Design a protein around this ligand. Structure first.
Ligand code: HEM
Ligand SMILES: CCCCCCCCCCO[C@@H]1O[C@H](CO)[C@@H](O[C@H]2O[C@H](CO)[C@@H](O)[C@H](O)[C@H]2O)[C@H](O)[C@H]1O
Ligand SMILES: [Ca+2]
Ligand SMILES: [Cl-]
Ligand SMILES: [Cl-]
Ligand SMILES: [Cl-]
Ligand SMILES: [Cl-]
Ligand code: NA
Ligand code: NA
Length: 611
């Protein structure tokens, strides 16, 4: 028996060339070796795994043929709703389009409540001893990833409501004894393959929509209509409407941490507007907006790719891998001087002569949503520090007060932030570790949370988010943990002890799920899975990232065929090329806290990290 019994069927159907790739990665996987080898072999492994996933784990939802026809040269900018990127598909990546899938759906209609979402939430997710990431990853990094989800994906809801009630066995430990919510909207695909789909009400393109808006009706509200600029308050914080809702791109179900990143990137955009106007004085407001949006959205993609992900996956192999996606294996020096050389590996995904969607129209997917459910990253309390205080017993800015992060959330949080200010919020977030993605680390304020409508206003029905998330994965027919692994050519668990060596986790899991490893929910598995050294996430989630993070760059005209001076302006392109991370953005606008307190290379590391 060479191949794992559960992957023999798919192996036997593979082409000769896919068989070779499978056997290569599987040789490492059977011995858990890919991340224990030197960088060059690790990269070969990752590229081989990626190619396999691109072939087997991109599934269209909704008819792929047709699509409105247009001239790409009449759309050399990022449209407000994300349309007109893909020359062969004007709708691809735009607002209100189907989520794709990475795997065939698994119907769970008869087990939507098995085991009970409140039991799962209470016994497995609810924060006990707080666990953080040490120096590796800070609260800016937790905020960053939510800021990105607001740039990426949100499921259209059904107008009706349903409700669930905590069973007597755990009701006493539940902050809410029941709650209502809207089911995920189901739309018929009218297609041969998958029959039911869900809509993404955000643009799937990496287009800065968290700052710019998800369509034209939204985007117009945020612009000054002078020099291409966006509105911002004199304190350097977002403006607010009279109902308390923030004036930015996507402000739904947010907190203060996201609000400061949005405000920071408003200033980034406006500073790009200044720089470009300087080189091209006769540009209109509209032209300046378009160029600055291209630059700023590219800056965001870049920061996420070669800074955030690099600190999230803190290994030599992943630094090399992520930099290779952006700059190419030939490296930054060659890329910057001589442009893109060779194919996707040597020159990188960015600056490819043509976009490549690998035969399947661009979309974000149901499973991409699932693996990005990282609410346990939010700490329980924020230690506020003094930007001009005397350095304490360490060389840290001194602590002024602990504040409960539940007070920093939603409309109330916008009010609290208006009293704290940017520098204090940012510095304090920089100097504190975020939470680890482990069992028993889901914040209690999420279990008693006020959700918001599309317009940012509060809903009167609070939710238990831990419980809801477990419900959403089942509701949307995402395979449960073990099958999820199988579909990605990963070795499934046979017993609980294959998942984790923590005895209490094993015992708690057994009492809820029995010994049926097929019943284990995805979210529970992703949090519980024993982690690769340096990895803040599970290997399982990482596999979706391998595929989809590449896809977000490779499928986009504006990171590929139109990643050039003609589309971005010369100054615009130079701005992207000379920005390497969030540090560079924070330094541009807030050089004094950066000089005084940012000691780490990356602004995503706890700011006194020694590297
Ligand atoms: C204060 C912090 C946060 C709040 C208040 C918040 C709130 C929410 C709410 C209300 C939902 C909708 C649940 C539903 O109706 O199904 C949601 C979904 C989600 N959140 Fe958060 N969240 C926070 C932080 C984060 C962070 C740090 C991440 C990191 C990746 C994240 C990722 C997601 C994802 C992936 C979804 C599912 C979205 C979808 O269905 O398309 N959130 N969040
Ligand atoms: C310089 C090097 C020269 C290169 C020569 C390469 C020749 C082989 C390339 C494709 O390999 C074949 O691909 C088929 C799939 O397209 C496989 O069918 C397999 O899978 C099919 C299902 O996909 C089943 O119908 C078949 O029974 C099953 O054998 C078949 O096994 C495999 O050998
Ligand atoms: Ca977007
Ligand atoms: Cl490099
Ligand atoms: Cl190449
Ligand atoms: Cl990613
Ligand atoms: Cl660059
Ligand atoms: Na194992
Ligand atoms: Na350095």
């Amino acid at each position: 028996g060479s191949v794992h019994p559960d992957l023999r069927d798919v192996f036997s159907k593979m082409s000769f060339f896919d068989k070779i790739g499978f056997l290569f990665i599987h040789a490492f996987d059977k011995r858990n070796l890919w991340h224990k080898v030197p960088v060059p072999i690790g990269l070969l492994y990752l590229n081989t795994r990626r190619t396999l996933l691109e072939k087997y784990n991109l599934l269209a939802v909704g008819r792929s043929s047709h699509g409105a026809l247009f001239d790409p040269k009449e759309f050399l900018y990022r449209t407000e709703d994300g349309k007109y990127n893909d020359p062969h598909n004007a709708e691809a990546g735009s607002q209100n389009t189907f989520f794709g899938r990475n795997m065939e759906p698994v119907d769970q209609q008869d087990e939507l409540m098995s085991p009970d979402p409140f039991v799962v939430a209470t016994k497995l997710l609810a924060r006990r001893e707080y666990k953080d990431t040490g120096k590796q990853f800070n609260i800016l990094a937790a905020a960053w990833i939510q800021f990105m989800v607001h740039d990426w994906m949100d499921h259209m809801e059904d107008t009706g409501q349903i409700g669930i009630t905590a069973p007597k066995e755990v009701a006493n430990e539940c902050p809410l004894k029941s709650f209502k919510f809207h089911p995920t909207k189901e739309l018929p695909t009218n297609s041969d393959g998958i029959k039911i789909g869900h809509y993404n009400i955000r643009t799937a393109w990496w287009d800065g929509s968290a700052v710019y808006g998800n369509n034209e009706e939204r985007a117009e509200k945020l612009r000054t209509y002078v020099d291409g600029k966006l509105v911002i308050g004199d304190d350097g914080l977002l403006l607010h409407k009279e109902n308390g809702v923030a004036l930015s791109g996507d402000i739904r179900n947010s907190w203060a941490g996201v609000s400061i990143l949005q405000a920071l990137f408003v200033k980034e955009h406006n500073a790009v507007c200044d720089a470009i106007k300087e080189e091209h004085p006769n540009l209109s407001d509209e032209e300046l907006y378009r160029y600055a949006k291209l630059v700023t959205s590219a800056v965001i993609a870049k920061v996420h790719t070669i800074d955030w992900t690099v600190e999230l996956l803190k290994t030599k192999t992943m630094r090399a891998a992520m930099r290779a996606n952006w700059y190419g294996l030939l490296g930054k020096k060659i890329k910057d001087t001589f442009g893109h050389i060779g194919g996707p590996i040597l020159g990188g995904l960015v600056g490819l002569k043509k976009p490549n969607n690998h035969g399947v129209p661009y979309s974000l997917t149901e499973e991409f949503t699932s693996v990005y459910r990282m609410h346990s990253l939010i700490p329980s309390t924020l230690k506020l520090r003094d930007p001009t205080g005397q350095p304490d017993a360490n060389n840290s800015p001194p602590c002024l007060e602990d504040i409960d992060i539940g007070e920093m959330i939603g409309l109330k949080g916008e009010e609290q932030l208006s009293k704290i200010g940017f520098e204090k919020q940012a510095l304090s977030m920089g100097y504190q570790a975020c939470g680890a993605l482990e069992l028993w680390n889901y914040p209690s304020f999420f279990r008693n949370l006020i959700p918001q409508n599309l317009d940012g206003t509060n809903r009167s029905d609070r939710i238990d988010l831990a419980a809801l998330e477990v419900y959403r994965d089942r509701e949307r027919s995402v395979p449960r943990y073990n099958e999820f692994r199988r579909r990605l050519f990963l070795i499934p668990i046979k017993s609980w002890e294959d998942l984790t060596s923590d005895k209490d986790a094993i015992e708690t899991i057994r009492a809820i799920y029995g010994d049926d490893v097929e019943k284990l929910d995805l979210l529970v598995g992703l949090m519980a899975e024993k982690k690769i050294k340096g990895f803040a996430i599970s290997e399982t989630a990482f596999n979706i990232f391998i595929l989809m993070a590449s896809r977000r760059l490779e499928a986009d005209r504006f990171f590929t065929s139109n990643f050039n001076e003609e589309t971005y302006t010369k100054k615009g392109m130079q701005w992207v090329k000379t920005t390497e991370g969030l540090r560079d953005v924070i330094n541009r606008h807030y050089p004094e806290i950066t000089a005084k307190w940012m000691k780490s290379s990356s602004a995503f590391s706890v700011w006194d990290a020694d590297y």
